[PDB]
Amino acid sequence: MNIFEMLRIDEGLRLKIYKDTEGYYTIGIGHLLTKSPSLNAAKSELDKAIGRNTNGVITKDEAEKLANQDVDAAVRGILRNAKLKPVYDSLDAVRRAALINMVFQMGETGVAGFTNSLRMLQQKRWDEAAVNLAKSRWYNQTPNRAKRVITTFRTGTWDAYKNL
Ligand SMILES: [Cl-]
Ligand SMILES: [Cl-]
């Protein structure tokens, strides 16, 4: 398994504009377009992102292109964040993918706010970290997805995604 297959499982793949779990216009593999309530604004951001008049629909290839951009940006964001970098550098490959997943979902700022969990992950206190990560709005609003990421941090294997 890899980060791409992981996100594919967690975000799904939609070729038409849709509303995510928080009600925001999104497209493809979890690519947020705008937090604005307006469909036209969504449509405008989409065309700007793709470089053509999409009419709110893209192809599979285009969706995967936005995902490559997004993963790459998540990674560079983590490496440049004083709070996230040290954690990421301390982790194994599997757990690094779990941190990317959280960044991708909630933004670097959001993740950098899990101060205590970050500290426990860096210390390699797996069970303690998993308990602390679960005391969050993230876990209460998207529990199935959060449990998969948390289990990944806990065990360091892709077990929660196998069968998916
Ligand atoms: Cl973009
Ligand atoms: Cl969920």
Curated annotation (Swiss-Prot):
For this protein, the record's InterPro entries field holds: Endolysin_T4_type (IPR034690), Glyco_hydro_24 (IPR002196), Lysozyme-like_dom_sf (IPR023346), Lysozyme_dom_sf (IPR023347), Phage_lysozyme-like (IPR052619), T4-type_lysozyme (IPR001165)
Induction note: Expressed late in the viral replication.
What CDD domains does the record point to? T4-like_lys (cd00735)
The annotated active site, in chain numbering, is 11, 20
Biological process (GO) annotations held by this record are: cell wall macromolecule catabolic process; defense response to bacterium; peptidoglycan catabolic process; viral release from host cell by cytolysis
Q: Known Pfam families for this protein?
A: Phage_lysozyme (PF00959)
SUPFAM superfamilies on file: Lysozyme-like
Stated name of the protein: Endolysin
Q: What is the lineage of its organism?
A: Viruses, Duplodnaviria, Heunggongvirae, Uroviricota, Caudoviricetes
